[PDB]
DNA sequence: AAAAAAAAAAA
DNA sequence: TTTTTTTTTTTTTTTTT
């Protein structure tokens, strides 16, 4: 009997693999009988233990086949095809709603009885993040609206300030929340073509620690980054479609994604300053440093850097009426859950600990 | 039964798909049964609900197939072949007529009973654009006729002015109205070969935001853009054919399109400036900014950069004797529809609102 | 009868061949008869004598085949697919535990009755290394813990001091222990992209002898390294996924590996110094030099740089509970072996010899 | 039945088509019944209406085939192969016989169709150039034959005069007649090699504005051009093959092209002056400068520079024996158009008005 | 019958062809009949006359085939696969042992009845070389041992002396004996990386004529070479692995080869002087110069540059037991042959003739 | 030289 | 047509700066 290419494509769709080697590796695990399969018995990874019993019969035939990489290539192109259809046909609010659904699915596993996480650690993260900026939850909500409306020349935000002020921490959390890529523009202009091509079909991009000039009077080293962004200011505008490039592929014509620029305090030419809607000045705070020294699990487990921490901040602080109607059902259920496992008394205690520089937990 | 490759080519020719991945994604949607299709009963996108009933029988067989990307590649090449036949065999006025017939079909769907658009916002769009330049509708009509004549050495218009002047918004509207591509020529000369290859078979080219050198006392950072256009001199003149390149596909020899060049107030070489037939100078106007702040629905729905807004300007201001003969009858239909919806007193009120800097629609 | 592609994939998986030409070369050795096989009689290389009996039948058929490279290519992709699945799905503890199992398998070959090595010469290396830094085994243990936890911005160590001070000796030993690669960031900036591409899917990276400007009055050469390294701030941090490239391959998005910087006495920017957790000052001290003049065998056999010397140092000095539970069984068998053919009275005499500056062995 | 690839190859050779997508598109037009065919009945394009009836049967079978691009690329290779067989065996007079047919096909755009500027002001262009130099039309034919014979040492012509001498206009006109390219030799010696390498595989060259040594006493800006060109004697004389370099490519060996040198009244060194066959002085004429002030369309429709006007001069004045046997019929077929449209008196009026310093009248 | 791919793979392995076109050319010569074959009768090339008789039948069928390049590709792959297995698994002693009996095969052909080499002239070369340095055969034997043992920091030699002293003569002879390649480190430091990439998988490298910077007052040109070697400390020392780069190929990691540095009477920094295990001083000698004038055949046949002359020197002067056991029997046969053709009185007469310049063979 | 996809052989 | 099998060519990288 022959291999069903359909069953492989169906597995790739359910798991969202866009890598041929990953898909080949995963599917070849299903050769062995599930009756004795140690990974299924341990329940270590969901993309194995859910699917092995369904795919065992087909994977045994697949391991005898001669054209295995061709089968996987067709499946990966099917996933990339759906991804491109969805980029052209969905509204940006639906794309964000789909992303929140994915995060909530991961939260159900992570805080379920098979999961590792304790919510007290994650909500201690919410408390630490809310101390970072005045009205943090309003800032996060204002950012989400800005990325959904995608208004020409009113698209990009600037994070500015000295070393260890939290720019990258908040930027990385917002990048996971929305889904997107970080780009390095400090490289010289010639190979910048293939860097920018990483942005194809992405929802956000972040430009990380762009270097300027003249900062040597403050002991900041010079570089090409700000000069390079001046050359790309039609990509920042978003009024008109730009041409984006991958090695050995022809150019994709699309409007470039919105997002965040992170900077140390170099001077910004007025031509770029005209592209930025809002500047957030980060400043370092002594009590936040003292707190992370006592509560190091926040850095080991990457809690303050996670999008799930910012999603929990939104679930806690925002009215239900600010979410899309499809997910309001799931978010009322998650508010009910958080209302059991916390009280305002525990959360206010956590905030008071952080302002004193004490450990978050007690 | 076997797959019909002809049916896939019919779907692709009816939909005008240039992308193999997009065509694959859309045709795979048809594998699910028509009797229950949620997108057919909600009528989300016409490229689905018009065609799914016809194609369900064939898409079931296509989903089992091993050749899927090869089938789509031949369908995409059939559509690209038609574009090359039409580009060489049609007159430029017939091409512009075909562009307007597609824009008007889009307007019929957009302002129909199924439509979402509100025409008062779009005619406020016309009013805002008419304030941007004196005798705007004559500037638009001169451009359209200039691009249809395409006389060698008199093919390019220069848009010049400071950091916020409206030059990009007007170029973007003309680009949708005429069709074309925007190109970035601030990058080094080496990789421009594949950038210029995007101009193959197009009607217009827009060279956006060409950086100059000197004028630095204005606080404009310098760059290679103007030096690159001092090269490429024969592409602008168009008195000769050029070779255009794209990856793996064989190169094509054609006369390069006409276009628009936008730049901030850099000093321009005389050898370049000799090749532009017209300069339009753009000035900041304080009242236009106050107007958009109070009427931001114009930016959210991208009305002031849409080609449809310039076509509605042309329908309103120009006589039917200035349009082509085949399109007369539907322009007569639209021009009566517009006089039925708007009293001239409403348009006069709108234009007075914009000059007064109050919100339009107030 | 026809060639089994399954047996070739099995041999490649057992041997871990990810080079197509090496696999082809190895497998074509099996076409000759097992009985007369001089390599099975001498027992030189284990990759031959363990497997020839099993694969003889299939290798004879493979030698008559017309598509030998197509067969080998699939096997090499199967091995790379396992490697990419393991990178995405294993914990860093498991990765390190697997690496220790591989080194212990090597040690069983080196010190078994077919092997060439003498345990007392390797153990002299441990004594010389334990004299290089104070509390050396705590330093090696702290490093492994740091590389496993991979805490953001707290994950690089700096080795700093004069020339001939032991930096690259120790760094090379740590590199073989953890597995990873050494990078030269002193290159010109446009070569630097492919130099950073060496790090893809590695556990550890080491930056060898980075040079700066200034300090030239100390007779230090000048160089670009520190300037380049300060463009790469976000690669060191590990907060976001960087985009890594190889020649002719599309960009891989992943978190950059942690590791070590080795440096002469330049000054360093605060932007970089904020990214190092620990600075270890290496000082030259002449008893170690006079020792190595007299105990030359340490240099000649490469014992002093090898990771197996550090692993032996961890087995001699650390409690058994500090190793992962799967490997504790082998480590107590090795502690028994070392206590049986080596003694504490010998070890303190070896260390006394090194401190006295005299040849280590009796 | 099955597709005849030979019939497709015959169509490609009869239409002389060397684009694979263009061939695919035009051949797919033949799949419809010729009894009904609107493009035939409208007689729009010869590449359709002649061939449809013959190719209809094959085109219907071709539309069902799965390998359509394979069929078309064999046919395009057949046309490219014929072109290379001819080109490698081409005499230099057959090269010019080909070059002027392309310019004639461009003039057949103003023949019998409104798609062009009015010829009456282009004959004023013929007249105005015939007033620039004594016996202008004989200068053109002597120059043409000089370039066709390629006689060593007898190959370069020198044009001298101040600003506003017309030398650049006639240099442009002669260049655009013949299809060479223009080179700049004012560069420092380090850069000349890539400038000279532009001349590869090319019919003519022009050297523009070679700035001399000294000349400030005539208010002429000094440069290296004359001094450089004196060093290029082996390129100018044309007896031996020079090696020429394009950027990134390997060298080619050929005999360097003939053509034109243009100068202000700098001093020409005797060693360089001996290499020019003929010096033509251009001198400013006040009556021409008044005429062109009174007849702006000469410059603003680019009549005087466009080298097509020099063929339009050769058309009328010159005998029939002065043209090759394969185009003698085609010129007299063209020439009777002007014999019907014009008279000696109106051309004498054109000349007279120019000589009087007024625009053409009556 | 049908082509045996196995017989072609044998021929490629026996000839060691890693070039597909060379193999294709060689194998197609075998289609013509053996009985009449002029190349076999004249015995011009051993790669033909040995094998033609065996392969005639397969070559006749191969000449009719359609797959000819694919058969040759697989055969070339088989040869390259063996080279990589041998590179990764052989001891350095087996590598040199294989290189010697490869040279003994060349010696057999040269000095056989079919050959063209006069052993009296080659033995005169051995005499002239033995007079170049004191204890020459021990110098050569010590060098071989040093390169085989590859002991870190005891693995580079320095050759120093005036121009025309014999340095590249001896260095070139040692390269042919061991195998290896020459390197030019006088390039600027940013062009050096592809030059160092020549060393990949080589047994030796020679640094040819490194120039110093000071000492110009002795008429010695200034250059970068020794300053570049000071920077490459870690490549020479050989304790740790380095990354090496070929054009278009990914970086490979290995311990850089041992070798020779050759220089004029430049000043050496003391840091570099400590990296050489030995320094050999070459001084011009008049009697060798006057001998070479009378014994010109040494230069004209390139005898004194060749590795075969050094191998004849080791065969003549060294005891049998210090060659590897596989080659001892072949060297005993060669010792018998040489003692048959030469007595000690003839050889000491040749040394006596050199020492006073009368001319070796008199 | 490797990757994307084409192009062909035998039942 | 189906399955198994064989083949092409270019871009990128280098070169250039
Ligand atoms: N506002 C803050 N005040 C004090 N310490 C902070 C603050 N934000 C972050 N930290 C600490 O500093 C570490 C680094 O933070 P982060 O990298 O986000 O800063 P950054 O301002 O973006 O830095 P850089 O300019 O180096 O990119 C965090 O892991 C945390 O321990
Ligand atoms: N004439 C104008 N006066 C004042 N504000 C203007 C004017 N035209 C446009 N604006 C404002 O400037 C914004 C940007 O307009 P636009 O993109 O056309 O500017 P531009 O001059 O082309 O810019 P750039 O020089 O950056 O390419 C608009 O969205 C609007 O808010
Ligand atoms: N602490 C030390 N004191 C004295 N000699 C030392 C010391 N450590 C190493 N050595 C000697 O110095 C030699 C070189 O050591 P090593 O390569 O580790 O130096 P390094 O300073 O780290 O080098 P680099 O900066 O060039 O990588 C060793 O082989 C040993 O002989
Ligand atoms: N004989 C003439 N007398 C006066 N004016 C002339 C004459 N011929 C041409 N002109 C006008 O003078 C202009 C400048 O001359 P032209 O274009 O030939 O450049 P040029 O004389 O080579 O000068 P430059 O060295 O400045 O480029 C022409 O374009 C035309 O308008
Ligand atoms: N010791 C010597 N004394 C005199 N003449 C010599 C001696 N060795 C070589 N010769 C002659 O000098 C020529 C040049 O020798 P060789 O190529 O070795 O020169 P080198 O100056 O030492 O090398 P390099 O140019 O690489 O530094 C030889 O071909 C030979 O004719």
Curated annotation (Swiss-Prot), chains A, B, C, D, E:
Zn-finger region bounds: T-ag D1-type: 1-92
Cofactor: Mg(2+)
GO molecular function: ATP binding; ATP hydrolysis activity; DNA replication origin binding; double-stranded DNA binding; helicase activity; identical protein binding; single-stranded DNA binding; zinc ion binding
Record entry for activity regulation: DNA helicase activity is inhibited by ATP-gamma-S.
Description of post-translational modifications: Phosphorylated on both serine and threonine residues. Small t antigen inhibits the dephosphorylation by the AC form of PP2A.
GO biological process terms held by the UniProt record: bidirectional double-stranded viral DNA replication; DNA replication; symbiont-mediated perturbation of host cell cycle G1/S transition checkpoint; symbiont-mediated perturbation of host ubiquitin-like protein modification; symbiont-mediated suppression of host innate immune response; symbiont-mediated suppression of host JAK-STAT cascade via inhibition of JAK1 activity; symbiont-mediated suppression of host type I interferon-mediated signaling pathway; viral DNA genome replication
Main subcellular location: host cell
Superkingdom of the source species: Viruses
Keywords, comma-separated and alphabetical: Acetylation, Activator, ATP-binding, DNA replication, DNA-binding, Early protein, G1/S host cell cycle checkpoint dysregulation by virus, Glycoprotein, Helicase, Host nucleus, Host-virus interaction, Hydrolase, Inhibition of host innate immune response by virus, Inhibition of host interferon signaling pathway by virus, Inhibition of host JAK1 by virus, Interferon antiviral system evasion, Isomerase, Magnesium, Metal-binding, Modulation of host cell cycle by virus, Modulation of host E3 ubiquitin ligases by virus, Modulation of host ubiquitin pathway by virus, Nucleotide-binding, Oncogene, Phosphoprotein, Transcription, Transcription regulation, Viral immunoevasion, Zinc, Zinc-finger
Catalytic activity, reaction form: Couples ATP hydrolysis with the unwinding of duplex DNA by translocating in the 3'-5' direction; ATP + H2O = ADP + phosphate + H(+)
Transmembrane segments: none
Cofactor info, note text: DNA helicase activity requires Mg(2+).
Residue numbers spanned by region ATPase activity: 153-351
Domain SF3 helicase: from-to ranges: 135-295
Annotated stretches, region: Binding to host TP53 protein: 72-362
Notes concerning its domains: The J domain is essential for multiple viral activities, including virion assembly, viral DNA replication, transformation and transcriptional activation. The LXCXE motif specifically binds to host pRB, RBL1, and RBL2.
Additional free-text comment from the UniProt record: The sequence shown is that of strain 776.
Assembly: Isoform large T antigen forms homohexamers in the presence of ATP. Interacts with host HDAC1. Interacts (via LXCXE domain) with host RB1; the interaction induces the aberrant dissociation of RB1-E2F1 complex thereby disrupting RB1's activity. Interacts (via LXCXE domain) with host pRB-related proteins RBL1 and RBL2. Interacts (via C-terminus) with host TOP1 and POLA1 allowing DNA replication. Interacts with host TP53, inhibiting TP53 binding to DNA. Interacts with host preinitiation complex components TBP, TFIIA and TFIID to regulate transcription initiation.
Function: Isoform large T antigen is a key early protein essential for both driving viral replication and inducing cellular transformation. Plays a role in viral genome replication by driving entry of quiescent cells into the cell cycle and by autoregulating the synthesis of viral early mRNA. Displays highly oncogenic activities by corrupting the host cellular checkpoint mechanisms that guard cell division and the transcription, replication, and repair of DNA. Participates in the modulation of cellular gene expression preceeding viral DNA replication. Isoform 17kT antigen targets host RBL2 for degradation and promotes cell proliferation. Transactivates host cyclin A promoter through its J domain.
Record protein name field: Large T antigen
Originating organism: Simian virus 40 (SV40)
Lineage of origin: Viruses, Monodnaviria, Shotokuvirae, Cossaviricota, Papovaviricetes
């Amino acid at each position: 009997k022959q291999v069903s290419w359909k069953l492989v494509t169906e597995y790739a769709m359910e798991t969202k693999c866009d890598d041929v080697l990953l898909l080949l590796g995963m599917y070849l695990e299903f050769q062995y009988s599930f009756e004795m399969c140690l990974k299924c018995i341990k329940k270590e990874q969901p993309s194995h233990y859910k699917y092995h019993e369904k795919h065992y019969a087909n994977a045994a035939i697949f391991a005898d086949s001669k054209n295995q990489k061709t089968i996987c290539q067709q499946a990966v192109d099917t996933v990339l095809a759906k991804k491109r259809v969805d980029s052209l046909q969905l509204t940006r609010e639906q794309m964000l709603t789909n992303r929140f659904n994915d995060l909530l699915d991961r939260m159900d596993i992570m805080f379920g009885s098979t999961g590792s996480a304790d919510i007290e650690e994650w909500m201690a993260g919410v408390a630490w993040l809310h101390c970072l900026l005045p009205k943090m939850d309003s800032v996060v909500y204002d950012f989400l609206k800005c990325m959904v409306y995608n208004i020409p020349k009113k698209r990009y935000w600037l994070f500015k300030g000295p070393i260890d002020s939290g720019k990258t921490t908040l930027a990385a959390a917002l990048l996971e929340l929305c889904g997107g890529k970080a780009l390095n523009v400090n490289l010289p202009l010639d190979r910048l073509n293939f860097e920018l091509g990483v942005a194809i079909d992405q929802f956000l991009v972040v430009f990380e620690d762009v270097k300027g000039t003249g900062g040597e009077s403050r002991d900041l080293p010079s570089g090409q980054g700000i000069n390079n962004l001046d050359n790309l200011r039609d990509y920042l505008d978003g009024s008109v479609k730009v041409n984006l490039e991958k090695k050995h592929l022809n150019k994709r014509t699309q409007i470039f994604p919105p997002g965040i620029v992170t900077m140390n305090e170099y001077s910004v030419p007025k031509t770029l300053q005209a592209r930025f809607v809002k500047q957030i000045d980060f400043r370092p705070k002594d009590y936040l440093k003292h707190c992370l020294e006592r509560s190091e699990f926040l850095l080991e487990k990457r809690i303050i850097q996670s999008g799930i921490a910012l999603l929990l901040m939104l679930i806690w602080y925002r009215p239900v009426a600010e979410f899309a109607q499809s997910i309001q059902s799931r978010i009322v259920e998650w508010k009910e859950r958080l209302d059991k496992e916390f009280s305002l008394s525990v959360y206010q205690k956590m905030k008071f600990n952080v302002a004193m520089g004490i450990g978050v937990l007690d």
